């Protein structure tokens, strides 16, 4: 069965599946967990960074796309660089041409259509990364989830990577609480740390291990690393 229909992305299986895409989806789960959640006033990214040795640095998980939008990654970083690059240029074009901040909904639609082109043409390969895109636009706080299948979804909260089901279930339970943390960035981040720590097992999140990013009403997208995330451990 599977072996015959997984050679390339241009081939359907007899059950109507795209195996090269389902293998790309597997690159995400093998990746280090990350979490997004929002209120009406702010959206947060919390990510667990992963080091090779105790001599190596922890690989950066959060990328800024514009002053009002950015994303966390899980899977191949070199693909996350390609898509975040593309998204930076869409945010850029909107500004220079229409003097208009790109809508977070429209960022989703553009990523989706770029992902899709790799999964219907011979010689291409699907992207091997998942992204949690957060922004504040003219219709407030937004959190997107991107799969390399092309599927983009708008959620109040979610997590992707290894053991990501722990944080996702916690959020699913906390929903009524964190959706109402409006005009308090500190308490939203604390709620997102508690979420990610539901996906721990190995270790306990430390100062040079935890990465957090926030965007909101009067907060441009900014990344907190090291000593800056001390007060949240």
């Amino acid at each position: 069965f599977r072996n015959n229909y997984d050679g390339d992305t241009v081939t359907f299986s007899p059950t109507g599946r795209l195996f090269q895409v389902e293998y790309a989806l597997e690159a995400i789960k093998q990746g280090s967990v990350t979490v997004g959640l929002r209120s009406n006033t702010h959206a947060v990214l919390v990510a667990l960074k992963r080091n090779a040795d105790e001599l190596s640095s922890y690989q950066k998980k959060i990328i800024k796309c514009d002053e009002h939008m950015g994303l966390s990654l899980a899977g191949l970083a070199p693909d996350a660089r390609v898509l975040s690059n593309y998204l930076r240029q869409q945010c850029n074009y909107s500004s220079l041409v229409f003097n208009r901040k790109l809508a977070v909904e429209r960022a989703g639609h553009l990523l989706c259509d770029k992902a899709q082109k790799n999964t219907q043409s011979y010689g291409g390969r699907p992207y091997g990364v998942g992204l949690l895109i957060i922004g504040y636009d003219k219709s407030g706080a937004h959190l997107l989830e991107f799969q390399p299948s092309g599927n983009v979804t708008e959620l109040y909260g979610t997590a992707i990577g290894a053991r990501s089901q722990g944080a996702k279930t916690y959020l699913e339970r906390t929903l009524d609480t964190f959706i109402k943390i409006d005009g308090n960035p500190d308490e939203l981040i604390k709620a997102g740390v508690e979420a990610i720590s539901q996906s721990l097992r190995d270790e306990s999140l430390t100062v040079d291990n935890l990465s957090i990013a926030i965007v909101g009403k009067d907060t441009p997208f900014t990344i907190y690393d090291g000593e800056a995330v001390a007060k949240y451990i």
Partner: protein
């Protein structure tokens, strides 16, 4: 021998293209969507599965508009459907640029039809993993279509595709028989909510969110619009009443 199903443009010994047949499996696996042709327009409805309480209500819109007068809904691989609507939009713009008039639905139908068929001519592409239900109002009345991964399309009185297609087709067939004079746009909207609720028993384990749109000459001035607020609620209640 065999291997007739590994390469897209290839004919089996019985004259079939297995790669197109396998794309149909991706569609059948999809969510249930329907079109209903009323006496001056068309109604589109679609089942949206709620994975979790985390999906924002109303916010992940599936029904897409082409030009200002055409509606499209699809079942199967959603990004494939999007790729086709982008082609739809380029095609309608191209036509309007040259001929001034907005594209007639039959003209627009064949434009999609020829593109999708092009994607069964070569082993270097994959067939579309969607069945598309689309139409609207032109110079000489309302038109409903459905378009398979093979490129096959026809006009329909009603159409349905994906998970719940047998429940829907059954319910559509009854309407065609019980209303020979025609259905109104107000009625067709209610009737469309009902057919999506009844066809959601093939998926009854997960909760769901109803989405409806319409193009009526009298009710929306021959323009595609979404059903919202009171008229959406009236239609939800009409189905929640009749499911019991």
């Amino acid at each position: 021998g065999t291997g007739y199903d590994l390469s897209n443009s290839v004919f089996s010994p019985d004259g079939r293209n297995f790669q197109v047949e396998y794309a149909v499996k991706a569609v059948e696996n999809g969510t249930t969507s329907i079109g209903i042709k009323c006496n001056d327009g068309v109604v589109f409805a679609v089942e949206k599965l709620i994975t979790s309480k985390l999906l924002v209500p109303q916010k992940n819109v599936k029904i897409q508009v082409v030009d200002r007068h055409i509606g499209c809904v699809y079942s199967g691989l959603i990004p494939d459907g999007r790729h086709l609507v982008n082609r739809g939009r380029e095609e309608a713009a191209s036509f309007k640029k040259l001929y001034k008039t907005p594209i007639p639905i039959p003209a627009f139908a064949d434009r999609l039809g020829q593109y999708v068929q092009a994607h069964t001519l070569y082993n270097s592409v994959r067939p579309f993993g969607v069945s598309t239900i689309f139409g609207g109002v032109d110079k000489n009345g309302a038109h409903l279509y459905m378009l398979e991964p093979s490129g096959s399309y026809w006009g329909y009185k009603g159409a349905a595709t994906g998970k719940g297609r047998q429940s829907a087709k059954a319910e559509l067939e009854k309407l065609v028989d019980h209303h020979p004079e025609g259905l109104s746009a107000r009625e067709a909207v209610k009737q469309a909510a009902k057919i999506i609720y009844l066809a959601h028993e093939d998926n009854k384990e997960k909760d769901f969110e109803l989405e409806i749109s319409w193009c009526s000459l009298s009710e929306t001035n021959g323009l595609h619009k979404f059903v919202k607020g009171d008229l959406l609620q009236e239609a939800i209640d009409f189905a929640q009443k009749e499911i019991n």
